[PDB]
RNA sequence: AAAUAUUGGCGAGAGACCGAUAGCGAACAAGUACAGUGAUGGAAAGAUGAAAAGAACUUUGAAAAGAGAGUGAAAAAGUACGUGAAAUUGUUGAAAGGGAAGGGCAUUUGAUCAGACAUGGUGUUUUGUAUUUCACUGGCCAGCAUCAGUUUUGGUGGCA
RNA sequence: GACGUAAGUCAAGGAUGCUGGCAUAAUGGUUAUAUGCCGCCCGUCUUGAAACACGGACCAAGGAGUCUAACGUCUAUGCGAGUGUUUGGGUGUAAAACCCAUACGCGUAAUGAAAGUGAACGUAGGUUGGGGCCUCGCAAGAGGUGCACAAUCGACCGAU
RNA sequence: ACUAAUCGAACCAUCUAGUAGCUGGUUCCUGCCGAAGUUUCCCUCAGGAUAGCAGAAGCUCGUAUCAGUUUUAUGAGGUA
RNA sequence: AAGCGUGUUACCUAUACUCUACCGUCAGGGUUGAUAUGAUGCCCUGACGAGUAGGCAGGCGUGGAGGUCAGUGACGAAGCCUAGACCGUAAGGUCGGGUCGAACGGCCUCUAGUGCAGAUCUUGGUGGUAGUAGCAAAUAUUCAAAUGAGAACUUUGAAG
């Protein structure tokens, strides 16, 4: 007999490999693995890592954003890495010249680098430069800026976004809302 | 004469029988949960059916193995025979039940004289 | 094909032995068994047959004659854990134990082929059996009673008790 | 499909996974949203707050064609013109002669003050405008034109 | 007028449909037999065999029918007819059996069942040159010796 | 690691050596029974079932969390400030497949009840922590840099 | 009382698969984890809603802002 | 005392603990400049394993769709029986024997009216209860001949 302590058999909660299907991503999951395991740089550990993560842990990371970690002195000619697909924008007019390394870029994304002069690869053609990742840089997508996330935290005093189909007066703007008509939340 | 293995033992040889098939007639043979909750058998009271568990499982370097000492694997036709020539030693060819004896004895002509192990030589003999 | 195929296929190689780290360590006999003490045999064609020890084997086993002409058993050999000792002794050095070796005692040769499906003692077996109870008989004939006892069987009584019985 | 729904999985379980004390009934809490006052009050209040009630006055016949009003900010004004002519007027910014951007034939109702435009002079015609867009166009040098 | 519905009727074509307790209630003489005064209700029942070639004829029996025979690829297809399961029953055989029997652990007994390796094989002259005509192995089960691990049980030594 | 001057040996990171008998019911399997001990009749309700609680004579077949409109979370996929061809049109080997314009939905701005109004002083702000990266550092470590994200204070739009 | 063996509201069909917080049943395997009968509110007491309790999906990180714990010091309590 | 009270030891056994083997789960890992069936694989280490409701995963099976196995098949497919065997932990699969006569499998994927022991379940069928209860109101029949194979019930006669 054992004092099980805590939850005994308990899975790691962490995802082992990903759960998508796509052969090419497995096939460069079996590039990263063996280079996470065969080098000693913490940075392909974490790329690696991130690189099971689902469509919505892989937002959409804009050139915009890029264009920002460019201008985060210090990484001027630093190479820019990104898990997930990588999108263009319209907000920024001047994308200065750099390499960008992400799974994937739309058509403007992919126009707008080029027509930066920029250098998109690919995360095969970023282990042929960077095995250890010489002078890269990490950039994540904003996670927090879903639908659903403003849908979390309900409770009265939480001021959430309610789960609603259809929106607008006369929904969830009575009695409870407002201290005119019986409370307020 | 097979590549020599651990020594033999199935751990439980036994069947498992459902519950209270014995004495019923329409009680399927094959094993199940009986998952009531007066059950007996679902917690094991000493003196009364334990159903299968993994402790019950054979060892791994003995799964899918004859007590001959094969892995059987069945064929249809002499084709289907030449992915396993190289591997008499492992694998054990079988025949089908749905195989003609006409065409049964040109296969065990073919594999016999290739010395693939068979096993069901004397199946829908002629005499 | 009513079974396709297992795709992951084992090796066909035999992977030699391990370097096992075992020696052929000499046997140390007890304290009882001296080259020349009376044994009984116990199990066997001549279950409780006295006899008389003449010399340990590499073959880790017993050369054991009681006198042929007395007991009516020959030289042989016996395993070590079948025997009881006596603390009866009697002198051997007077008899020489030489030539009987494992070799000499190969049974015959038995194959696959020349088999005896249905169902003649060496002549020197003989003599050598002679020579040796030359001096035995000479030897024994020293201390009144051991022939009878080298010749008699041995059996238990009632009651008598062998975790009390001193032999 | 149905060969992973779980009741496939489920079946043999007596319950089918709706419990053995509950044993699940038609519909045990009413039907709808029913009893939101009597014994489903918390639910429509702590998690559907301003549910019960209503409040402003009842538009008769409101028709969305009046308030049609896309929104355009100052940021997504570029994109109206086309990307091979966008970069060609990035550069060369011609106040004697400047792009214009029918947003009313883009269909883009009021042009709101996102901001940050490069000072490039640009027409803009649309239907309405904020305070600060026309000053954010005006530092820049563009002029807005009014079209209904 | 058109574009639009159509489970009625007719016609036409299809089905990732059902396959005779399903599918129309109805694959068959079904809205039938059958019940109810009536309003109504409402069935069960598809398949021998390629071909009836549907068992002539002999015989016992009053006859049915049986035994023969004979047709038939099959009569273990005979109109009580594709295959023919079980519950149930009979017969034979096998067993056991003192108010249950039935099951689990393991074993005896009895019945019954696959497997070894009997290898091209330490080769050893083809009767006008491919039978190595002696085996090399491990198949099973044991025993002994030496060990390693776990541990048990003493007996003796020195010491504080 | 020990023994060894070494050579190597070894009880040293998991059993070898030798011998015998048999090669089949011998071992083993299955089974039937007997034996020792044990075993309540199962499903369900219940705190409580073996119950003097209820369903269950038996057996074959049928037989019960499906479908869909709207969605939620999560995941997978494509595209991605866009997105969605299949309302329709063209086309066709023809309910297929392929192609195509239009708007149109949802997002790209919210906010008020409404009139309306409608998001940059700043490097799109600061602070704290923050993976990773970079400079130095044999290496700790030091710094510089800090994505996402956590909390806070700001700023801006709307409402009062 | 009887109104076709049906009567404190006949029978036939449709609505209609009327209804149900109530009873009964809910069909394969094996794994891994693993509960509650409690807060509050309800014409609420055989039921629901919530909080809790469970699994699963995971995410950010890597030895910590921790701990059904003791000790030091320091309180506070009105039971024996 | 085989009681009481007390104490000394020795001993017995739990799925308790310790050691080992094996299985599975989990965690940590290691495993590609010509070394491996080219990795959700293999390998190493260690810790664990109860559990209804409930949850999740990996699995087998049924009806069908697409592709594939130039798969099987009248010298015998499917089904069925089989104290015959084999494989799996099981879902089950495979083979052998017998009947049988015409379609059916394995793999990958897709789909579903998809897995039975229950529901005073339905339909159909057969049981023990069983050659038993019962076949007893109405006074009541008998002899003979005849038909007929067969007579208590038929005919007739003679009675009552």
């Known amino acids: 007999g054992i004092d099980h302590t805590s939850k005994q058999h308990k899975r790691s909660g962490h995802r082992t490999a990903p759960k998508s299907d796509n052969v090419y991503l497995k096939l460069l999951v079996k590039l990263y693995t ?11 550990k974490v790329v690696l890592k991130a690189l099971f993560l689902s469509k919505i842990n892989r937002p959409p990371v804009s050139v915009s954003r890029i264009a920002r970690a460019l201008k985060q ?53 970023l282990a042929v430069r960077a095995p250890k990742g010489q002078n890269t840089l990490i950039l994540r997508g904003p996670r927090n800026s879903r639908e659903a996330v403003r849908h979390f935290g309900m409770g009265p005093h939480k001021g959430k976004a309610p789960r609603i189909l259809s929106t607008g007066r006369k929904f969830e703007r009575a009695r409870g809302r407002r201290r005119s008509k019986g409370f307020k939340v | ?45 000493r003196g009364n059916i334990s159903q299968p568990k993994i402790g019950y499982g ?70 | 094909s009513a079974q396709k195929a297992p795709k992951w296929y084992p090796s066909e190689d035999v992977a030699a032995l391990k370097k096992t780290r075992k020696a052929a360590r000499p046997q140390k006999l007890r304290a009882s068994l001296v080259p020349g003490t009376v044994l009984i045999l116990l199990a066997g064609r001549f279950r409780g047959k006295r006899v008389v020890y003449l010399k340990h084997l590499e073959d880790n086993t017993l050369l054991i004659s ?12 016996v395993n070590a854990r079948y025997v009881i000792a006596t603390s009866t002794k009697v002198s051997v050095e ?73 032999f | ?64 064609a009046h308030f049609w009003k896309p929104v355009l900010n100052l940021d997504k004004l570029w994109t109206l013109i086309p990307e091979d002519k966008r970069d ?41 405008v904020s305070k600060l867009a026309e000053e954010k166009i005006r530092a820049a040098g563009g002029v807005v034109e009014l079209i209904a």
């Open chain 1, 34 to 44: 063996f280079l996470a395991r065969r080098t000693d740089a913490p940075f392909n």
């Open chain 1, 73 to 125: 002195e210090g990484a001027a000619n630093k190479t820019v890495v990104v898990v997930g697909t990588v999108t263009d924008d319209a907000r920024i007019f001047e994308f200065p010249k750099t390499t960008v390394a992400a799974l994937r870029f739309t058509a403007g994304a992919r126009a707008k680098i080029v027509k930066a002069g920029g250098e998109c690869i690919t995360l095969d053609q």
């Open chain 2, 1 to 45: 004469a097979s590549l020599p293995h651990p020594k033999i033992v199935k751990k439980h040889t036994k069947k498992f029988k459902r519950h209270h098939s014995d004495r019923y007639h329409r009680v399927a043979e094959n094993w199940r949960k009986q998952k009531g909750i007066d059950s007996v058998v679902r917690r094991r009271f």
């Open chain 2, 58 to 127: 054979s060892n791994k370097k003995t799964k899918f193995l004859s007590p001959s000492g094969h892995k059987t694997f069945l064929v249809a036709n002499v084709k289907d025979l030449e992915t396993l020539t190289m591997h008499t030693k492992t694998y054990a060819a079988e025949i089908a039940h749905n195989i003609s004896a006409k065409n049964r004895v040109v296969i065990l002509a073919r594999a016999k004289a290739l010395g693939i192990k068979v096993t069901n030589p004397k199946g829908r003999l002629a005499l």
């Open chain 3, 66 to 77: 009681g006198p042929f002409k007395v007991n009516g058993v020959p030289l042989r050999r």
């Open chain 3, 94 to 166: 007077g008899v020489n134990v030489e030539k009987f070796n494992v070799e000499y005692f190969a049974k015959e040769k038995l194959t696959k082929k020349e088999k005896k499906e249905a169902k003649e003692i060496k002549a020197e077996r003989v003599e050598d059996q002679k020579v040796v109870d030359k001096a035995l008989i000479a030897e024994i004939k020293k201390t009144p009673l051991l022939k009878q006892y080298l010749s008699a069987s041995f059996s238990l009584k009632n009651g008598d008790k062998p975790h009390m019985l001193k």
């Open chain 4, 1 to 64: 499909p149905s060969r992973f729904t779980k009741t496939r999985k489920h079946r043999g379980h007596v319950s089918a996974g709706k419990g053995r004390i509950g044993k699940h009934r038609k519909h045990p809490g009413g039907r709808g949203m029913a009893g939101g006052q009597h014994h489903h009050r918390i639910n429509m209040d702590k998690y559907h707050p301003g549910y019960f009630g209503k409040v402003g006055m009842r538009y008769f016949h409101k028709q969305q």
């Open chain 4, 88 to 128: 060609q007027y990035l550069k060369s910014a011609s106040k004697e002669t400047a792009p214009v951007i029918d947003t009313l034939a883009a269909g883009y109702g009021k042009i709101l003050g996102k901001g940050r435009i490069p000072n490039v002079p640009v027409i803009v015609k649309a239907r309405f």
